[PDB]
């Protein structure tokens, strides 16, 4: 299924991704030139899509998107600000039609010590721990740290 990893511009979204396939990571530039790999987990093979918040990336994410049905919406729990601006936006973006087709397994990153952002806080900031709707999943992490490894692949299995 076409599965989308979104998140920041300059995140090194990718960092994570290739950390993820490849173990060892990749530049904290996210993608910027189109990025798909398809992954069997549980032998349904999802093409997981890394999009950098190439400002343009965000815009084009909006542009192209149909054919989705599921997504790891990545967000920073330390980014307090374009986390905010975003929050609204994305939220709604999600509320634009087709993203209602998809469970949001949101990844909260940069949760790591003497500073991050309070799980509960952001949950209630979005009211967003919400089950006013969809199969959701919430997952903690400084994905850049890699934080929740099998749990993702597995919990996500749940359906």
């Amino acid at each position: 299924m076409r599965i989308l990893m979104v998140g920041l511009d300059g995140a090194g979204k990718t960092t994570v991704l290739y950390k993820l396939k490849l173990g060892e990571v990749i530049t904290t530039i996210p993608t910027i030139g189109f990025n798909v790999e398809t992954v069997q987990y549980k032998n349904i093979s999802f093409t997981v899509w890394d999009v950098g918040g190439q400002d343009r990336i965000r815009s084009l994410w909006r542009h192209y998107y149909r054919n989705t049905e599921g997504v790891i919406f990545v967000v920073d729990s330390n980014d307090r600000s374009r986390i905010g601006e975003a929050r609204e936006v994305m939220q709604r973006m999600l509320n634009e039609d087709e993203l209602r087709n998809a469970a949001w397994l949101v990844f909260a990153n940069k949760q790591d010590l003497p500073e991050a952002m309070s799980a509960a806080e952001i949950t209630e900031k979005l009211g967003l721990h919400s089950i006013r709707n969809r199969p959701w999943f919430i997952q903690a992490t400084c994905a850049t740290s890699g934080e929740g490894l099998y749990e993702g692949l597995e919990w996500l299995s749940n359906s």
Partner: protein, 101 residues
């Protein structure tokens, strides 16, 4: 004990040794073995600090491989399979702009 690489900015002495061990010791802590970096396969022949990112560093061994590490990897971030001989040495590219070893 083959090599020392030092963080200059930050008060550190990094060492690699043939014990197949890299240890970090903290001088301000008065030579603490602050952390041990391991992920070996042979004697540690050389350590060089990417001083550029002091912070990140690279390691050479004659089992032919190079591990580049992150602090959050008391192991390299990865190992790459360099030599067809052994990697005696690792060195950095003077410029900060681009990067060669």
């Amino acid at each position: 004990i083959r090599c020392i690489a030092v963080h200059p900015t930050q008060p550190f002495i990094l060492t690699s040794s043939d014990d197949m061990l890299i240890k970090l010791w903290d001088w301000d802590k008065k030579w603490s073995c602050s952390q041990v970096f391991e992920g070996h396969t042979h004697y540690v022949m050389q350590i060089v600090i990417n001083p550029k990112d002091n912070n990140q560093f690279a390691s050479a061994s004659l089992d032919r491989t190079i591990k580049v590490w992150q602090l959050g990897s008391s192991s390299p971030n990865f190992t790459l399979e360099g030599h067809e001989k052994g990697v005696n040495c690792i060195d950095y590219y003077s410029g900060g702009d681009k990067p060669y070893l």
